[PDB]
Every structure is written in C-alpha cells, then in structure tokens.
Symmetry: D2
Subunit: 303 residues, 4 copies
C-alpha cells in the first residue's frame, strides 16, 4: 500500500476507517487557520514542504478551507516541483453535521493521491466525486456540497466506488513544467485586486498604487472592461511601472486580448480564463521573473 502524507491547514474535515484499505496515511499540521485568512507565508510554507518532503512519501493530501482552496490550489499548481500527486480537499458541511461531506471527501482525496494515474496531472482538487485541475477549479456556490467546478473546460475525471476514470488532461503548463521556483523566497510581490461596477470609486486603486504595489488585478465588467475612473488610475499606474492585469468579475469565460481594450497602448495584460483571485496568483509569480507587460502576457498565455 502507498504511503500518503496528509497536510493540514485547519481543523478536521472528518474517523474514516476505510482509509486503511487504500493507503498508509500519515498526518502533519502545517498551519491552523480558516481559509479566509490564507496568505503568502502559508503558500510558501506549503510549497517548500511538499517540494522538500517529496521523496519521503508516495503523495500528499492537503486539507484546506473551501473558501480560498481555489487560490492555494493554483499557487501550488505553479510552484510544486514534486511529480507525485498533490490533492487538495475540503468539506462544505461541519464534520459534526448531518450528512457531513468530509469523510467521503477525504477518502476520495486519498484514492486520488494513491492512484499512480494522478501523477503528472498537476495539483488536484477532489470534491463531490470529481477530480479537478487546480487551475480551472473554482467555488461556484456559497453552500452547495457540489460547489467546486471547472467552469470553462471541465473536470479531469470522476471517482466511482474508489476507481478514477481519467478522460481529460489540461494543456496549460503546471508544476515541474513551469519556470517558477519559490524555494528561496520569503515573500511574494505585492499584488492587489480591485472591483469594477457602476460609479466605481478609484480610491481603492489609488491606495494600492500609493502603497507601491508591484501589480494590480482588475476585476473588470464583461470582457475585462474598467470603469473610467479606475481605468485612468491603472493606466497611469502602468506607465510608472505597476503591472496591471485585466480579469473579470464575470464567473465564466475569458478576458481576451483584442477585445474592447487596447492592451498594448496602455501596457495591460489580459487574464484569459483566470478569474481575479487566480489572476493574482499568476501575476505574483510572474512578477518574480519579470515586470515587462509583453512578457507577463506570454506567461498568462502559457500557465
């Protein structure tokens, strides 16, 4: 039986006797916070730990709060260099609740980490009998146990009675096939998100600029459009070094280049299918290699 390390970032999500049949599980408490307080330090802590301990286990499961699991999933998808499977898992209902989803979520997550088929597929989020790539996976509902989906290109496979049927694999480069390497970073570049809406104030953007933020993600309207005020600030900020990425508050679909913004004229980067919090993850990492907008755009076209 394979040896699987369980990395915990909060409390239990489940106690699950059926684990014995699949793997020799070992547990470690890495940090203990709710996922709404996730932060850079924990991301570095996690990636370094998976990367260093990679030869010591047959694979990792990370228990994590569902609220920002999509962010941590994508961060590890760009920075883990361990070829073995790294699977993330949460629960939408308390462990003590009726019909708690945790126990079977943790079981199915271990099934995935123990399956040789899951290697070289990137960081995975396993939820509601579904194997999801860390890039496209997002939380779509505030309460539904089925909440995690890949709303653009879909899941990688499904789990029925302990066996995964794999039928898709993502084209974007992940994990050991990416240039990012955080093993020697104690700090990620400062990147913030600003929302767009009718009559949107430019003060949130002006504040991140006056703080010297390395980059700013715009949660645009429609295909990455910006409210006039916010537009002007970010355009000024771009001309003085600040990287700005046009994402969208719209939950599915890409923010494309050659849309309604002349990104070349202003030095802006389009985020494609990466939603704002995910666009932030790539921009942070991108800023560890380059400040140049055309090169940041190439990166957003590749990862």
């Amino acid at each position: 039986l394979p040896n699987i390390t369980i990395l915990a970032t909060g409390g239990t999500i489940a106690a699950v006797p059926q684990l014995k049949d699949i793997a020799n599980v070992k547990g470690e408490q890495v940090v203990n916070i709710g996922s709404q307080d996730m932060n850079d330090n924990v991301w570095l802590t996690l990636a370094k730990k998976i990367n260093t301990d990679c030869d010591k286990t047959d694979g990792f499961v990370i228990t994590h709060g569902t609220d920002t699991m999509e962010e941590t999933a994508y961060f590890l998808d760009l920075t883990v260099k361990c070829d073995k499977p790294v699977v993330m898992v949460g629960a939408m209902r308390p462990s003590t609740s009726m019909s708690a989803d945790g126990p079977f979520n943790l079981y199915n997550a271990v099934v995935t980490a123990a399956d040789k088929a899951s290697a070289n597929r990137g960081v995975l989020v396993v939820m509601n009998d579904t194997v999801l790539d860390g890039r496209d996976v997002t939380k779509t509902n505030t309460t539904d146990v089925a909440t995690f989906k890949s709303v653009n290109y879909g899941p990688l496979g499904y789990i029925h009675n302990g066996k995964i049927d794999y039928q898709r694999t993502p084209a974007r480069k992940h994990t050991s096939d990416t240039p990012f390497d955080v093993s020697k970073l104690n700090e990620l570049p400062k990147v913030g998100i600003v929302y767009n809406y009718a009559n949107a104030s430019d003060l949130p953007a002006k504040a991140l600029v006056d703080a010297g933020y390395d980059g700013i993600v715009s949660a645009g309207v429609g295909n990455g459009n910006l409210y006039k005020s916010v537009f002007d600030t970010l355009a000024t900020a771009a001309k003085t070094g600040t990287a700005v990425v046009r994402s969208s508050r719209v939950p599915t679909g890409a923010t494309t280049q050659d849309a309604e913004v002349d990104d070349a004229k202003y030095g802006f980067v389009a985020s494609g299918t990466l939603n704002p919090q995910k666009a932030r993850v790539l921009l942070q990492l991108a800023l560890t290699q380059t400040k140049d907008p055309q090169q940041i755009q190439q990166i957003f076209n590749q990862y």
Copy 2:
C-alpha cells in the same frame, strides 16, 4: 398595436418586424458604454420612465451588457410605472456576423408589448428569455447566452413572439418599494471591496477615510472576510459606515448566522444579491435609514 418607447443609453444594437408587433418611438437619453455607467444615468432613467409612464404602453431600454444587471436592479427598485419596462443589449456588434442585436430587440419589444409582462418588475430580455431584474446576472464574458438568473431561474421563454410565463418574483419591487428617487440628485456613496488570500485592507481603508456611507464586501465563501478587511470593516461599522457582506461566489446566498456574527458587528448579509447588486440596494436603503437592522430588514424584503 401597443405603443412602445425605446430609451437608448448607448449605442446601437434595421429591424422591420417591429412594426408588426408595436408602434415604436425612440429617444436617446444618454450615450455611453455601460462600463462607465453611474449614479446620474440611473437617476435620469428612473425619472424619465416615471415622468413619461402614462404617455406610452411599455418601455424597452437598450443598454450595454456589462452593467445591465446593475441598472436593471436599480430601475426595478425605483420605477413607479406599472407598465412593462424591459432592458436589452447585444453581445455582438450590430455590424458583426450573426449579430444578436436585431432579434434581441425584437424579443424585447414583444415582451414590453405583452400585457402579461406588466406587474412583473423591471425585466431583462436576452437570448429568447425573460429574466427578472433582481436575479439576472452576466455569467460569461462573450457568450450570447450569458444572461441567466442563476439562483431562481427565468420568468419566461419567448418562442415565435409568444412568452410562456411560468414564474413570478416573490420580492416586492417597483411601486411596492419605499424608494422614491424623484427629488434626489445623488445617491449615498457605496463602494465594493474584493476579498481573497492576503487581501490588503487598503481599499477598504480608503473608502472609510473618504467618509463612504456604505461598503459592500465581495467576500469569500458565505461572505467571509480576510482578517485585515474584517478588522477595517468592523471599525467602519462602529463609526457609522454601513457594511453589507456579499460574496465573490457567483451563486448562492450570503446568509445571516453564517460564519460571521452580523448582529455583533453591525453587518448586513446580502443573501443572493451579488456585490454590485447589493451595492444598488444598499444605496437606496441608505436613503431611508442608517441602522443595520433596518437595512437588513430591507435586504430581506427587496
């Protein structure tokens, strides 16, 4: 045939079959892209509709898709006209191949002309579907089918100029609301902050220092808040700023008694209202009251 007024806010989205279903008169109220939509367009639109209500049998409003869902909820809360008021746009240029503009406008005029459309609140008509202004949101960046009522579904479908209504909104709207923008020249200042991992409290701090009357939080999950943002909004609520917890999550309610103690902090949960929607209601509420319980009552009724 019914008389329908079209009020254009753009932006052209040429359709001769209109004259088969209605007598059409057009007016240009303003001329902007909807990404620059703002409080004054909203006030002009509401007052134009209310003032001209009895001069016509229904309204169609052509409008950029980007903020259509915002304008629709506002009109739905402030229009005092019990004739149909139907919003419509296009996802493709009118000059584009297979432009949705023509048929979208045709179906919009059908809906405004259907007497079964009255008393349904302000409507959005896109991709052969009638959608209530409260739940309707733009779910995709480029798809013609982008507009969906992602929590409670559409009100009706249009086929060959016929609407089969099978649903009606339970929330009170239009003339059943206490908001009367008739004598207003500006709306309470309300901004939106995003939550995410490591989120800076600077964007919230800036709105506070500017004396904003309300802040809506695009929270994570069931309206949860990153620590920095939580600390600043909690202070803001104690020194008079109204704060509403919504969620960046595209579907589902931010519920009271969730993971946050709204009574303790003086917060209001938005329910199924997404952040830009919850901003609309919070503005109009801040014209009636500043007390968190009354605003919450409002967010429970409209």
Copy 3:
C-alpha cells in the same frame, strides 16, 4: 410542534436514525409499498394519491421517501392528483444509507423541515433534495450519481434551505393539486400510455407495437424540438387519425417542445408537450385521457397543467 407523516415506498434512506427530527416535528412512519423506483407503476400511484387524500385531515404534512430513479414521475403525478393542500414532500438518497457521507439523513431532516413550514402549503407537491425545494413538475434527475442530481432545469428551484429555514422566492404558475380536474379517488386503472425514442434510422416497430395493442396514448421522445424520424412520424400520424392520442415531447434534456414548430400538429392531431420531458408528458397524458380523447382538449390540458 407539527405532526408529520412519513409514507415509505421502498425503505430507509437513513427517526432513531435522525434524532434531530424530534426538534422540528412529531414524526410517524407508514410503509405504503416496498418496491424499487425503477419498478414504479400505476398501482402505487393510485394508492399514494388515495392514501394522502384520505389521511389529509389526520396530519399536518406528508413526507414520501422514494427511489430516485423515478422520483420525478411520482412527484408530478401526485402534483396533479393530490387534493390535500397541506405540504406533500418527496425525498430520496443518491447514496446508500450505510455508505460514507450518506445524503439520506440530511435529506430527510430537510424534507421534514419543508413539510413542517406553513409556507410550504399551497405550492403543490414538492421534491426536497440537496438543500433545495423543487416543484414536482419541473424537477428531474440530471446526473446518474451526483447527490446534486435533482434540478428544476427550465424554471429553477422554489426555495433553498439553510440551517432549517426556507427562503421561498418562486411559486409555480401551472395549476396543480386541487386546481386540477383530475380525480383518482374512484379509479382503479390508468389509461395506457407508452414512450418511444427517436434517433437516426429509428425503427417504427416500438410505435406499431403500442398501436397494435390498443394503447390510449403514445408520448414521443422526439429529436430536437419534438421532431420525429420518418418511420415513427408515418406510424404516429396514422395512430392519431385512428384515435390514439400522441404527444410530441423531446429526448433533449431542457427546453420546450413548442406548438407551431416544424410539425403541423393541427393536421395530425399531435399535442406538443411543452417543457414536460417524455416521462412527465406520459403522466399528464394518462390523466388527460381520463377526461378526453380529443386532441384540442389535450393540448389545452398540456397548456394549463
């Protein structure tokens, strides 16, 4: 606390099993029949509607535990035939009760929460699954294994349930329960209505087999907008002119089969099913056939219920 009856048609998706039940209602369980919902049939339907209608004044609301496979069929039948305006709520489990993270227990709690809520009255028969309150007419099973499978795929849910409280925001427009003229109280049998599938090169033999057996009605799971393959059309067009009511529905999972489509329904006396999928079309067709054989009346019924 409200008195709520649980009527079982199969048995245990999870009262000692779910103790929290005690906090919301006074529950009592009756075992009406014991079959798997894939073998559901007319006799069970007649028994349930008769049972619920007779016992209506002896309780404050019914919950029916049911197999998921045909939950959506029984719900619409009860929706058309129950005259008890008290909450009638169906519930199932996509996961075995002995299984890890079984959905049964919380499904049953939420179903009782719905049956006990005074606001659930006058909504017709409900299906309560995955924290969602769905009307018996539009609800359908969308996925073969997901605990989230039950969705109202055309007009959406009626309300959602969070921490034992329901937020209703919608109510179905089609007449149901006591607003219908269907009365099964004295019926021992239902008109014979079968379903045939359309697909490329489809054989007309299934259709001919129902016609040769004197079937009262045939529902076609057509392609696209209730369209019919050549042979099936030829057969069902003649079936109609002979007195066989035929309803054009569609295999397509969402959307209406519309009148005034590619099919001249008036010419052949076809009826368009609207948003009713084939198995739901059959329900209404059967009931329609207890009142009329006339196509124009049947089309009206399909436009009203």
Copy 4:
C-alpha cells in the same frame, strides 16, 4: 490559405469573410433534414471523407442540429482522415433575424483551417465552441447555445478567429479505432427503448421479434430497467441479442457494478454514452463481434 471542403447534408445554414481564411470548395452529399438521418448517409459520409482525404486540407460538414451528435460520433469512430473534420449547423433559420448559421459556418471554417485542430477526432463547432464528437450533445430544444459537452467540457473556445485549445480527449478515435466501413453497405440493426414507470415491454419485444442485432436501453438512473423490460432484455441476451444499458438521465455514466449484475445477464454498460450515442458504438462493435464481454471492452475504450 488552407483548402477546406464543405460537405452539405441538407439545406443551407447561411459568408464572404470565408475568403479571408480559407479556399472553400463545396459538395452536396445528400439533402435531408437530420431528423431523417440514417445508416446510409453515415456510410456515404465516412467513405466520402476517407476517400477525399488527400484532396483537401480540412472538411466542414453542414448538418441539421437534431441528430448532429450522432453523426459526429459515428464519423469520430470511422473517419481515417486525420485532417480536421468539423461539423456545424444552425439553431435559427438562415432567413431569420440574428440567424446563427453564418458565424457558425465562419467559426467551423476557422476550426478546420487551424493546424491545432488536427488529430482531435471529429469536432462539432457551435456557439463559438469546439466540442468533441463523443461528448457533445444537444442540451436545449431551441437555444443557440444548446450544444455542450455535458460530462467533460469543451476542447477550446473561439475568439476573433483564434482557438484557445485547452483539452483533448483520451478515448481512441479515428485511425486509432479498429472499425472499417469502406466496404460495408449496411450497419447492424440496433434499436433504442425507453424506461419509465409502468413501462411496456412491447417496444423491446418488437425489436427482438424482428431479430434485431442490438438493443440500447434508455434506462432510469444508473442504467436501471423496469421489470418488464428487464425480463424481455434478459431473455434476448441469452438468445444472442447484444443489449447495452444506457440511461435517459442526461449526464453521468451508466457504470458496471451498478444495480444490475451485467455479467450474469450478458448486459453491456455504456458509461457516459447516452442512448443514441450508445447505439453508434454498439452498431460498430457489432461489425466486429457479437460477444458481450468483447463489446464491453469496446465501450471501455472508444
């Protein structure tokens, strides 16, 4: 510019901008509405494409939407041309307002003319989306957005004439299948039966008595069968009829080790293939073997 051949199987769905992306030659193979699609059109199409393969750089097949998902998967299993072959249709009449056909065709020609589109099997391009011929199904009755890959999602999206491909299907297709129809005049006879409450066994018994080679069951839930239909189909299996359990449920798989002991009765489970798609593979499998276990392996692979 690439040479692209458009093969028509029915009327027109509409385009001068084609000239800017490809050299377009058109052939009219048949002319039927796709609801009358049949084994013959399918054989004509496969042979057409396998024979003209070196005569062009890509194929576009204009086709009615009704049975588009069936022809798509048949060609996906039988075409040996590894050049792109893209199928396209329209949900709106070419003469109608906002007809989707023109742009549909434009994007189908873009997809075929893209070198990235090669070696992906047969593709269906509708509503700016590139879908694989196995998983694409028609999900709505009238919506232009109707075609979706309901189990695994699309392969790419089309924006301003460029495809962002981000997925490719696992199952072997085209030249990687053992199916060969170059010399076949007819295909094995497979019917489809529906499951529902109180379901009559008469449809299944008609197919048996005609000595059908195969029967696909549109089952309930996880491929389950009504008592009557079970009995008949268990009987037909023993006497040599290949039966496949599919499901009327529009999403998810019919799995082995479900509520049916498939080995005991000689039944085949169809996985994520819906009934009409199960028929495609069951027919083709029947050109290679009649044995229940061998037919199951084929359903696990293609």
